């Protein structure tokens, strides 16, 4: 309905994307009887976590 060169005419659905940043950390990983990761503990997350 509106020309291609203009910003208008390129309508799409509402989608939100997340971006995080990785910082070096030491994480304990818990496997399960079948061999899949279920729970993790981050040391810096809490004194309890430490």
């Amino acid at each position, epitope marked *: 309905l509106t020309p291609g*060169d203009s910003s208008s005419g390129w309508t799409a659905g509402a989608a939100a994307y997340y971006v995080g940043y990785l910082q070096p950390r030491t994480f304990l990983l818990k496997y399960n009887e079948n061999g899949t990761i279920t729970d993790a503990v981050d040391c810096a997350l809490d004194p309890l976590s430490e």
Partner: nanobody
Amino acid sequence: QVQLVESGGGVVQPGRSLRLSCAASGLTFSSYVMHWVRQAPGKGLDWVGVIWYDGSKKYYADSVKGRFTISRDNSKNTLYLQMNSLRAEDTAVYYCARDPRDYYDFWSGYDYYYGLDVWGQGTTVT
């Protein structure tokens, strides 16, 4: 910032040859249908022709026949037009204009015509 540059103006000896060319800033020159509009000194606007994205289909107005040829050079970013003769039509100002109707727009079943968005600086043809 979109700008189309006219060239090949000036008064020459009347007849048999005259060179016009229209440049285009940026890299969006190709794939956009382009038309040439001639401005009469006191009789309003008129048409010259039209060329598509690849130049397979070309059409000309009824005002002039057999004297105009339109071609586009993709690498040089300049469109070229030639007049094989110079008739009594003098002091006509020629503009080059870009129309956003791309190949995909007429590829889709939709039948739509947009508007001549950006125009050139203009030139003098005598």
